[PDB]
Amino acid sequence: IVADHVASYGVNLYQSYGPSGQYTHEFDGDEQFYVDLGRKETVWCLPVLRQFRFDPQFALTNIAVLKHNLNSLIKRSNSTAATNEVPEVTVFSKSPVTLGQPNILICLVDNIFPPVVNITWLSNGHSVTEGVSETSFLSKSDHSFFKISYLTLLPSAEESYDCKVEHWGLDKPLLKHWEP
Amino acid sequence: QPFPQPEQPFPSPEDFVYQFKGMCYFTNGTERVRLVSRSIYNREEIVRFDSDVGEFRAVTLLGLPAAEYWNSQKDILERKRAAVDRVCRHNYQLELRTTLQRRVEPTVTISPSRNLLVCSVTDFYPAQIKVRWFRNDQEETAGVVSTPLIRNGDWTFQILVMLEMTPQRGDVYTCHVEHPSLQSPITVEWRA
Numbered sequence A: 001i002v003a004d005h006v007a008s009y010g011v012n013l014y015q016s017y018g019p020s021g022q023y024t025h026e027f028d029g030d031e032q033f034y035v036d037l038g039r040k041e042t043v044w045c046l047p048v049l050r051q052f053r054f055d056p057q058f059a060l061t062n063i064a065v066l067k068h069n070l071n072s073l074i075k076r077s078n079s080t081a082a083t084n085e086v087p088e089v090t091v092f093s094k095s096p097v098t099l100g101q102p103n104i105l106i107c108l109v110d111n112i113f114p115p116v117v118n119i120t121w122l123s124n125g126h127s128v129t130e131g132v133s134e135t136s137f138l139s140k141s142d143h144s145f146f147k148i149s150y151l152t153l154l155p156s157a158e159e160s161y162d163c164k165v166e167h168w169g170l171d172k173p174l175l176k177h178w179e180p
Numbered sequence B: 001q002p003f004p005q006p007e008q009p010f011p012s013p014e015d016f017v018y019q020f021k022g023m024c025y026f027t028n029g030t031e032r033v034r035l036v037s038r039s040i041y042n043r044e045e046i047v048r049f050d051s052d053v054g055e056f057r058a059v060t061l062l063g064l065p066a067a068e069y070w071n072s073q074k075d076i077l078e079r080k081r082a083a084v085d086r087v088c089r090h091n092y093q094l095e096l097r098t099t100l101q102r103r104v105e106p107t108v109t110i111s112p113s114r115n116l117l118v119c120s121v122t123d124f125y126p127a128q129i130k131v132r133w134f135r136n137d138q139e140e141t142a143g144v145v146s147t148p149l150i151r152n153g154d155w156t157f158q159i160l161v162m163l164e165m166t167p168q169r170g171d172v173y174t175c176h177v178e179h180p181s182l183q184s185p186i187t188v189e190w191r192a
Ligand SMILES: *[C@@H]1O[C@H](CO)[C@@H](O)[C@H](O)[C@H]1NC(C)=O
Pocket: A078, A079, A080
């Protein structure tokens, strides 16, 4: 559909493995907020949006409808499960890489399905836990997902970085390299 | 008060996925608003409510029970029929004083490639932007390769507009950037 603005109010997700769910709202491809279903908390992604209120119970109640609708569909489709997809990984910096100045590495894992994945960072072949954040599963018109991970860093002339992606559609954990 | 769309109830390891997308499509402000509710099994859309259709329609044979059953209920049809005004048009009012007011000005930097000049236009919102290379106020257009619009995920965009050039004495290269958040287009020059 061709339109000036595309909004999702919202994106409802429930899957059997876990089991896990996700409730988000999107406007023009960006996440407005998500509901921590385990905490019954609304977490806005734009500070300007903190002024609004959103009942997390709606998300919980909506997700419950998805679980009931799923079990119906699992049987009726003769147990047709999800096809594992090959995710595409791209690593880039948030700003131009000026040495000695803080920056953020951005790892875009696109074409994710099913929405199950670890995204982790590596520096010189070592696990990097601090400074790592990530978005939710953002929707796509083909009904796959993409997730973006962030790694804050002070780039230097010798420290290399790898974005690591483990996925079922992946025979081996995928590694996308980045160097200043 | 952002209004959500509800989903109606139905009448390596393997995994089963269900997706519901309550979507709104806006054009020319609010004079052209369209609502499409999508019920998705795995990655296949099965049931749909298009505001331009006005009734539930089964995309595949799997959603055929649901569409027929959901259409049976006059109450459910009538709630969904009014959702365009109640959800889409209502939420666009909140968007007009928040998301649609977001103005992040881009940062423009020029640097030779790691010959090739790279104009980095980083951290801007909204996505509408135009970048043009000029050479002595003569617009370069044949040796320009622009990367696709990059979504950073934190409500900012970035784009890199390359240019392969032959540098000679006394030639200035300028990157012209136009963005809604700018009162006047930004020009970053480059001398060798
Ligand atoms: C699907 O139905 C057919 C009946 O012809 C059956 O042989 C097959 O086992 C079914 N699939 C599953 C996953 O049970």
